[PDB]
Amino acid sequence: RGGLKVVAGLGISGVSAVNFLHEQGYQVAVTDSRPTPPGHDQIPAGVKTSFGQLDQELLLQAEEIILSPGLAPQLPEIQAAIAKGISVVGDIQLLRRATDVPIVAITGSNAKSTVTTLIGLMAKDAGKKVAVGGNLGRPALDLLKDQPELLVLELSSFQLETTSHLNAEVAVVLNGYHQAKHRIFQGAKKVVFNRDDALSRPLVPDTTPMQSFGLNAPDLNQYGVLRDADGTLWLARGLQRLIKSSDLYIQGMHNVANALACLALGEAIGLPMESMLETLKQFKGLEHRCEYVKTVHDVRYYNDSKGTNVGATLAAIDGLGAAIEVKKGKVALILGGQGKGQDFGPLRSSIEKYAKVVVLIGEDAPVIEQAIQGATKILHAATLKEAVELCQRETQAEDVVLLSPACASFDMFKSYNDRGQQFVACVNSLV
């Protein structure tokens, strides 16, 4: 009975929509241009399928189409349905109709994965039953099974294109692609925006509370940074210094901005400041992404195995080096692997400024050495284990050890994930 729901595009997302609508008792059909789409064996037996073609006649029979974010609304089959007046929505719309649970909604670039994870942790630590998903993580509809008290949704612009009246409790854009992302603010109860990104500030009614974060001294009731005369950096709310940047494990100005964004999201949903700061103190970062591993004899060890190129490693050295400079710390840096023909010259100035030793590993250690020599002490290691042990020998309190190799891993490892896992095992075996 009732109108036909047609899911356009299967995959992980489409599977969740087919099963959700079927479970709810809707008449559902699914179509996908691939003859054997991923998920074809994961949907109920009675559901009509039209695979091997995007079935335009079927789509034009629909009362509503659930479009995968992997399929553009501009596809001609979908355009025919839109011209006929058929509702075209996505899985996020289905989720919003199904629950009034408060949503923290996040969109933007790749900075958003750190914020999504951290605000989820802050909420959990504050005692909330939280479910985190969307975009590339858990399918949004699957989060309902948890009966959560709070949803944290990381949303792509593609998901937002088919979402209306999201009515999030709080929403933020972290950087017509701009217009798609700003659909995240439709009906938002509260807004957070980035003072350092003019495009993040939405046009919302004057009645909507707004709070900002940014990497400068904040106005009353906004999030920012404050420096002491000696250079010590504090995360701040208005005139109030909250926590020293050196008391966080995550480091660098991008991570300070991520933390400030999370404090603002948490304040919007009522998380106590005391709980949020304790979460901040403990958060180690995302795996392999200048990830804090452990402190051994007053030296912190950082796994940036994801830094597979010069530009990424330059940012990591600069960020961590500037972050420990006030305390007079220096970086012990592990570099090397497959250099991919890169110019390593751009690392020299930052190594000279912030590093006390570089330990070279891997196939292109010779070409890296030519690019950086004179800038600091250079050692060589035949294994990652030896490199970590040499870094431990060369460091003292307030120094850091950084694996940020500027190189691919495949001469000695299966992937940067393997290399980072092995670095973490090496660090954990230190005595």
Swiss-Prot record:
Transmembrane segments: none annotated. It is an enzyme of class 6 (ligase). Pfam families: Mur_ligase_C, Mur_ligase_M, MurD-like_N. Its EC number is 6.3.2.9. GO terms for cellular component: cytoplasm. It catalyses: UDP-N-acetyl-alpha-D-muramoyl-L-alanine + D-glutamate + ATP = UDP-N-acetyl-alpha-D-muramoyl-L-alanyl-D-glutamate + ADP + phosphate + H(+). The keyword Transport does not apply. It is found in: Cytoplasm. InterPro entries: Mur-like_cat_sf, Mur_ligase_C, Mur_ligase_C_dom_sf, Mur_ligase_cen, MurD. GO terms for biological process: cell division; cell wall organization; peptidoglycan biosynthetic process; regulation of cell shape. Its main location: cytoplasm. GO terms for molecular function: ATP binding; UDP-N-acetylmuramoylalanine-D-glutamate ligase activity. ATP binds at residues 108-114. Pathway: Cell wall biogenesis; peptidoglycan biosynthesis. Belongs to the MurCDEF family. Cell wall formation. Catalyzes the addition of glutamate to the nucleotide precursor UDP-N-acetylmuramoyl-L-alanine (UMA). NCBIfam families: murD. This is UDP-N-acetylmuramoylalanine--D-glutamate ligase. It comes from Acinetobacter baumannii (strain AB307-0294).
